[PDB]
Amino acid sequence: AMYGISVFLGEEITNDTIIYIKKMKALGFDGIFTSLHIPLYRQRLTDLGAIAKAEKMKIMVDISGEALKRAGFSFDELEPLIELGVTGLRMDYGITIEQMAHASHKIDIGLNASTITLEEVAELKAHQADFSRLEAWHNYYPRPETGIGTTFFNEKNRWLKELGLQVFTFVPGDGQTRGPIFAGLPTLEKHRGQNPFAAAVGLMADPYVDAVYIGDPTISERTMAQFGYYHQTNQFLLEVAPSESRYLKRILGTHTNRLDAARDVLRSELATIESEQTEARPVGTVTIDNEKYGRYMGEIQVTLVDLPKDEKVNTITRIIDKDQTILPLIKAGNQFTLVTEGTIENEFRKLNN
Ligand SMILES: [Cl-]
Ligand code: NA
């Protein structure tokens, strides 16, 4: 059950990057992925391993066979690399399946989820790989419209897991995005430009995914706060639009979704509510039942689908567009906290003083 981040060593490790790494660890991230092209970097890797060892974080290094040798390392003499703080290698160029099998008893081995064949997997068996140390990593997709689909992904992952492997996947970040396109580094195209927190949490719930990594350099403070809030409290933190409603304060705060969860709505399980505004209820609409609903007066709901106008249901505010992909994550019995737009960062700050 791993969350991870990416670090880009094509640039010098800034203080912002170190600050980031340390904060992500405190937010429940235990892993680092980094991809190296070396046409120096050896000292950069020595600096990063130091951060990771101290911070108790793993490092998977994606590197070509030649870039590894031209980094003064060799795949057959791994003690130095392990000494550095590297816990895994994903080789793509120039290493045999056989070398990889042998290396799996010493270090985690990254495979390419999309290209690994049943034959190569059978060869790793034949060479007595430690399959408990084999990680099948999906790729990420800088170019919009080129990420993989849910079906293929699900299909692939089931197969991978059936073969005994671990499944690792990326979500994009929304702080500092990687160039040259700056459109995020998702694995799944449906995550393109989406809330990374909602993307990560949803993927992690999938029974065939073992780990989720931020593909881009950083996530925004807002998104960090959502991870942090969920990690410390098990609550989903979402923002709502400003409203003039008299019932706004009743709906701000923590709610628990009923354990017998409705198809259409989230239902908050816990004087007179007068008729106020009773407008259409598009997805994300926060509502309170008024006095016309009799014994249901005061029930608080958030719509999961577009619902029509109802005279008996006051419409109070709406979940912020960006947080609406969190809504399907909120299952039977899950808690969620509604805060007013722009305050997610200070709301998470408050938790920690
Ligand atoms: Cl899809
Ligand atoms: Na999972």
| Domains (range + CATH), the chain | 1-234 (3.20.20.70), 235-353 (2.40.100.10)
Distance 2 CA to ligand 2 centre (A): 9
CB atoms within 10 A of CB 236: 25
β-sheet bridge partners, residue 339:
239
Please tell me the number of the ligand nearest to residue 148's CA.
1
Resolution in A: 2.2
Distance 209 CA to ligand 2 centre (A): 4
Which ranges in 163-275 belong to alpha helices (H)? Answer: 196-205, 221-233, 248-251
Residue with tokens 């709406």: 318
| Cβ contact 338:247 at 8 Å | no
Cβ-based neighbours of 32, under 8 Å, separated by 6 or more: 4, 5, 6, 7, 21, 48, 52, 57, 58, 59, 60
Distance 147 CA to ligand 1 centre (A): 9
Distance CA 63, CA 81 (A): 13
Cβ-based neighbours of 202, under 8 Å, separated by 6 or more: 325, 328, 329
Distance 168 CA to ligand 2 centre (A): 10
Distance 205 CA to ligand 2 centre (A): 5
Distance CA 98, CA 197 (A): 38
Distance 187 CA to ligand 1 centre (A): 11
Distance 176 CA to ligand 1 centre (A): 25
Structure tokens at 314: 């006051």
Method: X-ray
| Cβ contact 213:171 at 8 Å | yes
Distance 153 CA to ligand 2 centre (A): 13
Closest CA to 156 of 172, 140, 136, 171: 136
Please tell me whether residue 160 adopts helix, strand or coil conformation: helix
Cβ-based neighbours of 221, under 8 Å, separated by 6 or more: 175, 345
Distance CA 26, CA 19 (A): 11
Please tell me the number of the ligand nearest to residue 209's CA.
2
Distance 16 CA to ligand 1 centre (A): 34
| Cβ contact 51:19 at 8 Å | no
Ion ligand 1: residues, CB within 5 A, are 149-150, 190
Distance 190 CA to ligand 1 centre (A): 5
| Cβ contact 223:238 at 8 Å | no
Distance 189 CA to ligand 1 centre (A): 7
Distance 133 CA to ligand 2 centre (A): 17
Structure tokens at 250: 């009743």
Amino acid making up residue 270: L
Distance CA 179, CA 307 (A): 41
